[model samples]
Target: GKIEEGKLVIWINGDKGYNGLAEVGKKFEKDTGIKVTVEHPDKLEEKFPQVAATGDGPDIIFWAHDRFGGYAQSGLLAEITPDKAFQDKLYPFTWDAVRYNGKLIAYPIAVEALSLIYNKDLLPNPPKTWEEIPALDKELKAKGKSALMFNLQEPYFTWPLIAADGGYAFKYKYDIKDVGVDNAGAKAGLTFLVDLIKNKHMNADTDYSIAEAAFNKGETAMTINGPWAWSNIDTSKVNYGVTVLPTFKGQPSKPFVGVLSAGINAASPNKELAKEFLENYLLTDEGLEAVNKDKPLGAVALKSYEEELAKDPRIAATMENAQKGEIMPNIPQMSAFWYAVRTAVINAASGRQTVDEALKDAQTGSELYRQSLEIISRYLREQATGAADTAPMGASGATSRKALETLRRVGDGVQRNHETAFQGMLRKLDIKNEDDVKSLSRVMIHVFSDGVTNWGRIVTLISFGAFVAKHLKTINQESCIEPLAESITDVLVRTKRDWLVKQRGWDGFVEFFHV
Candidate 1:
């Protein structure tokens, strides 16, 4: 069959992403004759990796640079030097992400950064730093209100503030070798954040809809967020203002700068056509204007029409404070950092651990992982002539096997805990009489015996029995405790037996131990 008819295809985020690209595509098509096709996937995150992994993806895709770090490190991206020829023509700070390995890799499009969006009517000016917030929180508390709103539910949003206080995921240098994360700076950063949560200056309400509704209803004074919320902002009766994040100890409070860019696919058959489209159409003044109009993001091209941006108040603030922002690291090692940072921050917020303890654990965990990977690489090199089955230092097949066993034990513990908890709950409901409690216990025990007979099952049965004995009044109101126990017991027995037999075999378990 003839090669697919030439068209510049792009995969972008949502309606907003496609619309932005469509606007630029239209301008490109007008200046040149290349027809551009735009596709917006609802599940861009899930679909993007699959397409990229298969080496079959769009000619261009729009995504933030932070999430693409791994791809760049893995050589899964099409490298380009969009700023080399257009450096002077682009915003100075917008190309911050292009400096990986001292080479420009992609064309920077629009920039986004966090800022304080406040209700002007309530607090003519918002607090500038974490210290300024507590007094305001005290004032709000006296008035029975919350001073600020943040997505404590998701830890990524708080990371920049932590970094601004000198916390870092991994020590990043121009070179990748200096990427260890456990350090004093990281500890200090996590401590500052955890203290805020512990002191009630911040609360964990990560649900965007919940936070937005509260902010719009004027239930909160201010929120730290990005331009993505512009469309959802309530401007009706609420007077509001935006400003750059307040600094702590005169150190600039930089937010995370998420640079959205257009990436070309190395596998595209129409690479020449795509490059021509980008050079002749996408980079033009008119094309940039069209893109800005559709997206309303901070301009990446310094020459993009300023007068047009002046029409939107949010655009100026986004660009103004973006200089203080850090382009999110895109290296594959980023995934590990994200997980570690989130775990540490959330553990502190959830009262599971002290901030210092959480951060310490996170740092140690991340460093261990990095070191283990290095050891694996070293072993692979040393045993180049050895059998392919030879396992590496920390991640050999035995390591994975041990990890699986640990997971299984954890899973078992959780199941056992649930059984214990459920029994306690039932006991709390069993204040009826000895006869009722005994009947419920008998049914539960019979079910346990007939089902996958095991020590764990017997323990679960005994727990249910004791629970019924402890709560007589509650059980008095319940006419059919046996039915309920039978139902739950039957399901657990059948499922556990089937799973154990299928995975661990009958030899591993035959009958419940009765001592």
Candidate 2:
């Protein structure tokens, strides 16, 4: 059993092609004589999911940490707790990504992050922060040169700049995870991006390809890119170097860490063998060398590859500081962070709000959206258990009884105020027409005094009441009622004033109506 050279099947996404995997497979077979049948799936999304769902995937597969949470939660991933012996040998960040609820599921192979890459031929150094880049760009513009370059459409490329402004799309607090785009930090971050668009320091229309070409042609001075851009750059004619993303308000620019790992299928007949193949091929020196050959300066998942990354001075510094980087989480709610961040940034750029306001709104929206799941869960449970105490008749469909009571109080106050106004208008008009007065009374009762029996119908009734109020006229005069009614309508539609009336409705409504 110890010496049999059995075949090990490996599946990979062709985005990287066989160049990286082939190197490792060849070396593994040459060194250990264990034959590997490497399969690069043409349709990775379909193939990987099908294999994973069927519980019969390749023994070893390469995937990002973001997908790990789903596989681990579904029990599709083989628990790597059995391989704790290899813990100290792997990169801490890489190992951290495979871990889920105290269980390890994969072995990391490569890690990537965004850094400030500048052409020394155009500009000797990168700007200190995103704020500083505009000024530098201005200087370059005077000389007919691009100040900086990046993919405006790619949120991944610009997210760190937002993070540098001290905003995060999602944050976990006390085991309750939610979006924090509406927080002060998120607002500040978004505000900075809006300012960037307004100042002409960055271009939203510029494509990544355009930026790359501009940089390679020596038409641009600097860019916030990753290691992948290095070989693509026209390095034969230009000198370039990289540095950590600049800080804002003394806060570090936090870039997303993309760690790739080899995950094992839970249904594999040879789960132990799968683990052994991954560690022997990916965690070892020969395996890491093949995975990291492209970036002589790129960081590897193994401690043994540290020296290789340090061969370049800039890379050496990056490696040391990479320890300070944040690992992208594998949580399912993680998608909200990416999706909400773009909208927040775009809102800021479009001047819909101050950058801070946009970011704050985004964060708040994220938290509330996540909280909805819990709210729905509780409501469903209450209904199933016939929990009378938990049910309430109000605006929130039995979920917010306090809110309903407040709305009732508001309805009562509105009735009182409308009655007083009708009385006063009659006194002012000196009208003997009791029919007109009686007609007005009916209108007043329906508009203000009518209590909503069906909470679901409140919105429609209240909207109709407002429409009537807008056209309301003194008993004889054709002119619309001015000031008071108009002001109430304004308050209702313009601001969240309806909530105020609903909260302390009886008292507030009476005061508002009478005043």
Candidate 3:
């Protein structure tokens, strides 16, 4: 509970976040007789956990709450519980971002959600609901102004619209259950987007930069944006007003609410000091103001500070909307959504597939991919049994073999599409021989990371190896598959061996999935 000659360090993702803490640390160090250091590291998420396994990471990390589940489950974070009095002072959903298995693992510092940002000069009155947006296109067409613009490929911005109908990646309460992305409601949300494009309200090709750039110059009257876009947006030419997104057909459109949270490293020497600073210093009224100075703290997490933050237009609108939004689920299953849906949305919007086909098939692949983890975990355990040395695979192996038989009995249409995507992935990687297979690990490490590991990441890594195996058979070099699998096992067992044992080599993975 006391700080003496101790030192506390944190890794943050940006200079603004860093500078705010640096100033806070300056005071903290002087008063407590402890050194407080902060670094804005490049690729913090990718590199942090890799170094963390060896006890080389910082005492604290400031990053998105989505990583909280993976980090805490992997034993990289220390669990914490705030006093009920303090907890009562903040918005309830903020806590949801940092909780894993019903326990608090991090402190939510800031929160944000997408809302309608409009250039008031172009269209003085904003539409109150999404149904009204289509009609404004007529007036805007007269002025050569666009009604709405948002990137569809990045599901982050448009999920609320999709969820408007009843589509969801998972029925998540942190304990995630069913995947509902293919439901009728989800189809309606996506259908709205296609109709918007068909009416030429915006292009299917509108991207993150394109929409933002257009909004900054006042070319577009309205765009779905959040707090982060404020500093970058040009308020000079366009008299802009921020407001909640209109409801979709009168039903509330709930965007995914994202939180920036802080966590203490389980391996840190000064864990209490790190926790104290995060709880006492970072969320204070003045302290939070500094944190929001550079990029906006979205909407402040604490109720009192939220009102103070709402003085700014962006946070004001954001706070108003965030209340109605859904907390983005922070589960390993969340990873599956990121991997599967963007392409599905884009393909549908770009006319490559009907909305029905894209949603139905993407639902198949994402759910299949998620369910495949249990098989992967068992496969890993069996691989370890044979090597740690199953000629026939273990009792566990037999169980998994039976399980995979059920998995392999997947529908032909969805599996064919899945295989087609993998074929394109092989073509994308241009793998033709064992030399390419031998070098694939280096490529994946570069594209992803070498050291950071988590259950979700482990799931993804197995897929990469599976990709290589799939490639070898295509070229009739099936001999290389075992060699590749063995090499990867040795690497994971060598580096993440403890993690493997703790996760029970995929037994833990199945437990985590609860599917």
Candidate 4:
């Protein structure tokens, strides 16, 4: 398909609002005679891939940066090479969010992260570090107010403290081989939170709604929240101030920063037009301002727009917070991290397990999960290519099926060990009685079973890989072997991790592996 003259289609998430984008669409048409059609999809993540597979997806789609890796790996997104002039106009971290496998896949629009939201009437000055919170808590309590509050159960809210203590999910930006959720740094971080709860400085049962309500009613002096929560906060009801989350134990409390971005569809016919619209139009100061008007989305990537946004103190605070934050990993492996970490946090917070024990379990579980996938993936790849005899599994092509059966039996034994160890830990931590232990065991068993189910899917994909290899061999496309195997492994790893994250939540997922 040649470039369609005077026509372009784009998709935007409906929840983000379309008025700002509609305004730009009209201008784009006026300036270039390229009539732009903007479609709002309630489920862009689900719909984009399906539509793109049929070659009907819009020229561009706007979404969170985290989904970019999945789409990029599936060949649904086009690689972008922004000119040096355009690249220079954006913030450095913004670029990091758009890159997948080292290739730029999107145009970054806005940045978001959690920050310390404080009420000005109670405490005129924001504390610079966690050490100040104890005294401030005493002072605020004297005035019939609480010093600080946030959702205690959610790991997303708890990550800043974990990070401040030098705990990380992965060893590197793209690698999932090394999980650090149970590392010394993470244990230190969890210890801090547990101490806070035990010392009566914070309430363990305060969830998001309760915390928000308390802060709005002036029951609390400060709360950790995001910019999006600002809309719910009434300035008249509570004089509020937003600032970077304070440091803990002499280390910065870095929140996870997420970017809202616009990416081109690989299957689109109007790729050039889509690129131009994003690079030359939507990213421009005038265009960004129009979008920000509907809702101060955050500081735009462009420096000129960032400066203008900084004029507003709230937006300035958000930008500052993002600067001190780490970009949230968008890879599928992140699912395992979220699940494992969340579970570890809950276990430690609830006093069901010691912080170090909880984190160590989480790390071990994740390691086993990955190892299981790697073993199965390698075995399947060798079987598919009829290379099992010469491969690590050490079985001839004729005996590969038997070899697989033997490996499965051995893997099952290993998995049973993991299950037994996890259950033993649960029993030891059952300070109450068998009733509580049984209830906890039931929930963990279900979570671990879900992980087992995911591994089953990996086995199925491996079988599918064999079928593909059989067909490829018939066509004498032997050169495609390595690439196909790599692709299969990537898909299986991603799918398994995503399942773990979605089913268990980040904390539960982390706990599942560790447990």
Candidate 2 residues 303-356, lDDT tens each? 767655657666654543355456677874454455556565655566656665
Predicted candidate 4 versus true structure: per-residue lDDT over 1-515, tens digit per residue:
33344488788865454678888888998888888888887667778876776566788888778777768876889899988999999998889889887899999998877889999999999999988898899888898898999988768789988988778776664456566677677778789889888989987788888998899888999999876567567543699999988998888888888788999888877888888888888899888867766545676788888876678788878868777778888775554566677788887888888997778667654553444444455554554565654444321222333435544444344445455553555346432432332233334334444545644444444454444444455556545544555555444444455454344322332233332
Predicted candidate 3 versus true structure: per-residue lDDT over 332-439, tens digit per residue = 545546555776788888999899887866665445433344454434333333332123333245335554443233222233546666667767878666677666
For 265-333, candidate 1 gives per-residue lDDT tens digits of: 656677677766766666666666566556455655555554456566666777666778666776655
Candidate 4 lands at a TM-score of 0.68
lDDT values, one for every candidate: 0.59, 0.57, 0.70, 0.71
Worst-scoring 10-residue span by lDDT in model 3: 406-415
> On a 0 to 100 scale, what is the lDDT of residue 76 in model 4?
87
The prediction achieving the highest TM-score against the true structure is 4
Off by over 4 Å in 1: 1-5, 14-17, 26-46, 81-88, 91-96, 99-103, 141-145, 175-185, 188-192, 195-201, 234-237, 304-320, 380-515
Which candidate model has the greater lDDT, 2 or 3?
A: 3
* Superior candidate under lDDT, 2 versus 4: 4
Q: Positional deviation of 174 in candidate 1, in angstroms?
A: 3.5
> What TM-score do all the candidates reach, one by one?
0.64, 0.65, 0.66, 0.68
Query: Candidates 2 and 4: which is better by TM-score?
Result: 4
lDDT of 4 at 149: 92
Query: Given candidate 1, what's the lDDT at residue 459?
Result: 38
